[PDB]
Write a protein that binds this DNA or RNA. Structure first.
Lengths: 85, 205, 80
RNA sequence: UGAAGAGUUUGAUCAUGGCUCAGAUUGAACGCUGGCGGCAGGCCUAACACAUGCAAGUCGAACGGUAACAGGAAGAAGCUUGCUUCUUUGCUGACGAGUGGCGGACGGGUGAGUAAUGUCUGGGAAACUGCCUGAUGGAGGGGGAUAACUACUGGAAACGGUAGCUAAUACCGCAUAACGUCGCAAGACCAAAGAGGGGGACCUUCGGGCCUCUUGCCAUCGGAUGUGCCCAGAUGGGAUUAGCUAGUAGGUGGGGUAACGGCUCACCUAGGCGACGAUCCCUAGCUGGUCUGAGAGGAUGACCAGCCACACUGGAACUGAGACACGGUCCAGACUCCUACGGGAGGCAGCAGUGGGGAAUAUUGCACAAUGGGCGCAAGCCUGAUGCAGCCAUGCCGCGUGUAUGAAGAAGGCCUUCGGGUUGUAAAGUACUUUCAGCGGGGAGGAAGGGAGUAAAGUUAAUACCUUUGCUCAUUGACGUUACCCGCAGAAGAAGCACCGGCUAACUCCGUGCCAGCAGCCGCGGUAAUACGGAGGGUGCAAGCGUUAAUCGGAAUUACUGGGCGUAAAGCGCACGCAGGCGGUUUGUUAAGUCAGAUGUGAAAUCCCCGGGCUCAACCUGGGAACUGCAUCUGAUACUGGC
């Protein structure tokens, strides 16, 4: 014994206390633009995307979504806003 | 494996000389061939075709003392390169060290030659030999060790070798007691009574 | 991840020692990428018992593979 | 341009056939009998089971630290007057525990599950990818925690829980903002860790600012090696298995993922599959290959090569490139094991001994020396991996148990209308000579470097390290009757087992008398039994010999090569007919199939021929020759398909 499960399976709770609080805070700002694509006028979704992107990419430089997920959250969402004027 | 009967019992059952229990008497005395035939063959049997066959198979084996599992291996090696089992089989028996040590005159029989190898008395290419079931090739040199040259059985075997036809497959010098192999033997140059008519059809029907 | 290493060969008690390029994964004697020589211990009492392909070895270690310090010391035996 | 046959239905004859047998396979037992080596292997049997001891480590050149060792440093002694000694001090070499990173998803083991995205084989698109290696930019400044150490608690306790202190390349803000985010595009947005060496101007108790070097950190994108997914081909039994789905059948928008997908939540419909064998139970992992044979075919996968699955039995998450992760986390249950009797701890399917099963399968051995892999920019460590020692009539292979000479042929036995024969050159003796055993005498090679001195534009700051080379110090073996070879007194310790009418050879004389016991089959046996038992011999094999389940050949007796259907074995009581299958002759045309050509493949082994090296040979190795096959891209269209 005397193995790494202590800082792994047991201290992944200290990461849960940080990652989960970022993921919910982030998903709220996504849902505040994924509702705004019902229009009128693109500016609402454009403004809400411009309020989403700054807090998404704040999780995309280290940890949570720093490898692939941050752009995955934006890719098809751009193709959901550019359908407006 | 051994033969624990009188060694002339085989020749007396065959009505033919097999080169067994030989020494300074050389031939015929007291071999009693057709003078003491025993309890069978006088009166030579007809029996099954399975006779010649088996009793003819034993006569081509026991003349070289070879065991059945050896004889089947030489039949496998004689069935190589289309050389014919009626011919290239002779080279695997006559080319064997317990026949070479006998043909060179170090032993008076193939048994006595085989014994001299099991007693480490022989060398092949400057190294001592203990295995007598081994093939000799051209340019291989065979000799008796100084520690064994004075045994009376070798003394007698060399005097018997002078009473025997010289082989055209290997050489030997009586002063060094050293001989060298030269060429692999051939049916029409061995020029003697050994089978063909059965060694062309073994292990099949 | 890939090392220029020894392969014992000869099963029990009769080694042949070949030098090969192999991954740290899988096999410990066979399954190698390229052979680069031999270190035969019973070489007919002749100096023919050691061979090393120094050009191909230099390209393997240049490109990023590990060379063993045991083999680096044996490069001296083929001159040089 | 390729090859084992005989016996036997009857009063007997000829066809045909059931059966028995030849030689292997061997991953064995019996049970007599047992003189010794050489090589290999060691539960195909219950995912049944166990005490005790092991099997996974490691770095202070990431870091807070300092019990211990020695120096440097500052003092104090012996006077030994140049060192020895003592104290004090993490400055340094370093290091016990801990923080942190890497590895422990490997090397292995087992075969329970599974007729299957599990295996073997070739391609693909929407993909990643720690390790290895590259480019182009960045490289400032803060803070909250927590172990060690302690306080206390359940304690019978390995402990590990409840609370406290403190540090980092651990964990979280600030500063900076493209090669990147998404797109055709303006444009918003965010991280990092430095660490250890080396040195010049000026000066110091070096307290060097600052540059330079090595090796790391962040991003973005490549190279490589691997891997997840998607496609097309091989892969039991049962058709008296006839029913099977239902994230099934076809669409829609998010969320999840590296990424396809009913992965996953919603919503939009009602089908989809099957007798041309869907589907489900029973059994079973699969394959390089091995075994058999002339081959087809059949059998089979241990051992040596390669995947998958599985970790008390069942189940849940984390960590990550990858795992419901043999020696980790978290639970449940069982059975061992322990108890201070309050409850506590264990994983043999890694390695050892062993409980139990079975006809049946190696020692609780020695060592990290060699070699693979793991840490550390490395010396050095770990290892039941590996390398050695010990075991076997279990196999494959090999040897010995003494040679000469010794009679019409002894004494005895056994056969003999008693002439003779036979045991038997065997013995008695007479002349010589030793293998292995035993006991001694010699003796390889496995082992090579690192630390350093030295010294070059290789590198740099052209006097360290690093890079590199010769010599000179330093200096590594568990195994030793090592591998291999030679001797010594002495026949010294050394032979058994099966079989004997016909097939299929060796047997005469007795014993028994349809009795007792044999085999592959008829059967052998009632007073003259070649088969049973006994005497004396014969025949074959030999440290064995006989004997067998289990797999092939022979078996053309399932015929694909290679058969038969009037009557032996068979046309299925007879007419119509869809799919299926078949189809005259000729000009075009497609080019799937075919053949051609080319590019890949058929690994390592192995079968065959010839070498090398270890008693022969096997084997382990080196080269040829094969592996008649398979995948694709072009050509030709005779012919089958197609138009």
């Amino acid at each position: 014994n005397i193995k790494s499960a202590k800082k792994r399976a047991i201290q992944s709770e200290k990461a849960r206390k940080h990652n989960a609080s970022r993921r919910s805070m982030m998903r709220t700002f996504i849902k505040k633009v994924y509702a705004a694509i019902e229009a009128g006028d693109k500016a609402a979704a454009q403004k809400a995307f411009n309020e989403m992107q700054p807090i998404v990419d704040r999780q995309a430089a280290k940890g949570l979504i720093h490898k692939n997920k941050a752009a995955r959250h934006k890719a098809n969402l751009t193709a959901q806003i550019n359908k407006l004027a | 494996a051994r033969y624990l009967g009188p060694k002339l019992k085989l020749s007396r059952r065959e009505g033919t000389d097999l080169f067994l229990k030989s020494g300074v008497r050389a031939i015929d005395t007291k071999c009693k061939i057709e003078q003491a035939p025993g309890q069978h063959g006088a009166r030579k049997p007809r029996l099954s075709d399975y006779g010649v066959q088996l009793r003819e198979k034993q006569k081509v084996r026991r003349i070289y003392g070879v065991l059945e599992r050896q004889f089947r291996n030489y039949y496998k090696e004689a069935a190589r390169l289309k050389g014919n089992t009626g011919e290239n089989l002779l080279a695997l028996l006559e080319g064997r060290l317990d026949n070479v040590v006998y043909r060179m005159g170090f032993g008076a029989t193939r048994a006595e030659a085989r014994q001299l190898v099991s007693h480490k008395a022989i060398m092949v290419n400057g190294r001592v030999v203990n295995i007598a079931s081994y093939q000799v090739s051209p340019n291989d040199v065979v000799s008796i060790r100084e520690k064994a040259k004075k045994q009376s059985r070798v003394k007698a075997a060399l005097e018997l070798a002078e009473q025997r036809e010289k082989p055209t497959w290997l050489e030997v010098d009586a002063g060094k007691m050293e001989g060298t192999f030269k060429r692999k033997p051939e049916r029409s140059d061995l020029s003697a009574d050994i089978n063909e008519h059965l060694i062309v059809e073994l292990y099949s029907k | 991840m890939v090392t220029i290493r020894l392969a014992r060969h000869g099963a029990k008690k009769r080694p042949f020692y070949q030098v090969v390029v192999a991954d740290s994964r899988n096999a410990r004697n066979g399954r190698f990428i390229e052979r680069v020589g031999f270190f035969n211990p019973i070489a007919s009492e002749k100096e023919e018992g050691t061979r090393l392909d120094l050009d191909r070895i230099a390209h393997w270690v240049g490109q990023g593979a590990t060379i063993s310090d045991r083999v680096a010391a044996l490069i001296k035996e083929v001159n040089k």
